[PDB]
């Protein structure tokens, strides 16, 4: 599977049948049709800048990744009762600035989406079990709106030189990743899934209302990672974002 014609959403069904499921993601946020849940706890990220672990080029994307051995770096409030451990956080992209999210808000498409994604740990003893679960990961999602350069996201770009291809990976340490978070932490809510193969419904995804910035420059940086092995053709990772899905009846909750 990819972002290619032959190998990408349009055909991820073919081999992963979940993708026309009921809890598909990403999805459009219709502000008009969410409900104020007043159930909802505010959202508490505390994270350990020693967790942060390595960058690494995925072919279709580059993942951070952080050692999820312990709760030093965790997730709680909102709609959880459970803790949730942090374990990765990527962003996805698309071609122009035009699009580039995956979620969208009342039809607006925004430039670059940031997932801070964590399993839960009260309930199962691994991310690989915790997977394929209805209530097993938690991933906040950030959208990135195109203006001022961002400088909270710099050391993560200038890591990118280091990981420029294919299957290379290198140490990232001493990283907060809440200092990339919007100011305020009001958000939706809704259950759904990975964005990209394998498609698991189980995720609750927790959506920012406040956007965060990025510049055109640095979307650039993105697109110039490369998706193939040192050696070969260059082929840039140009987007990596997913059409929105149906919610098929599930309803989305705000936080404010
Ligand atoms: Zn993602």
């Given at each position: 599977w990819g972002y290619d014609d032959k190998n990408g959403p349009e055909q991820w069904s073919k081999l992963y049948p979940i993708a026309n499921g009921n809890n598909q993601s990403p999805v459009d946020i219709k502000t008009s049709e969410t409900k104020h849940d007043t159930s909802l706890k505010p959202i508490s990220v505390s994270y350990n800048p020693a967790t942060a672990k390595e960058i690494i080029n995925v072919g279709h994307s580059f993942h951070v990744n952080f050692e999820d051995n312990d709760n030093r770096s965790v997730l709680k409030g909102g709609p959880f009762s459970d803790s949730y451990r942090l374990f990765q956080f990527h962003f996805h992209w698309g071609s122009t600035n035009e699009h580039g999210s995956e979620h969208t808000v009342d039809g607006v498409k925004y430039s670059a989406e940031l997932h801070v994604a964590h399993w839960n740990s009260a309930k199962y003893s691994s991310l690989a079990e915790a997977a394929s679960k209805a209530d097993g990961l938690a991933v906040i999602g950030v959208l990135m709106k195109v203006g001022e350069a961002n400088p909270?996201?710099?050391?993560?770009?200038?890591?990118?030189?280091?990981?420029?291809?294919?299957?290379?990976?290198?140490?990232?340490?001493?990283?907060?990743?809440?200092?990339?978070?919007?100011?305020?932490?009001?958000?939706?809510?809704?259950?759904?899934?990975?964005?990209?193969?394998?498609?698991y419904e189980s995720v609750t995804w927790i959506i920012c209302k406040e956007s965060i910035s990025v510049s055109s420059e640095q979307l650039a940086q993105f697109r110039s990672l490369l998706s193939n092995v040192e050696g070969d053709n260059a082929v840039p990772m140009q987007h990596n974002n997913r059409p929105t899905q149906p919610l098929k009846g599930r309803t989305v909750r705000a936080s404010f």
């Open positions: 909270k996201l710099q050391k993560v770009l200038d890591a990118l030189q280091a990981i420029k291809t294919k299957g290379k990976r290198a140490p990232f340490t001493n990283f907060d990743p809440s200092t990339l978070l919007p100011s305020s932490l009001d958000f939706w809510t809704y259950p759904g899934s990975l964005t990209h193969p394998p498609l």
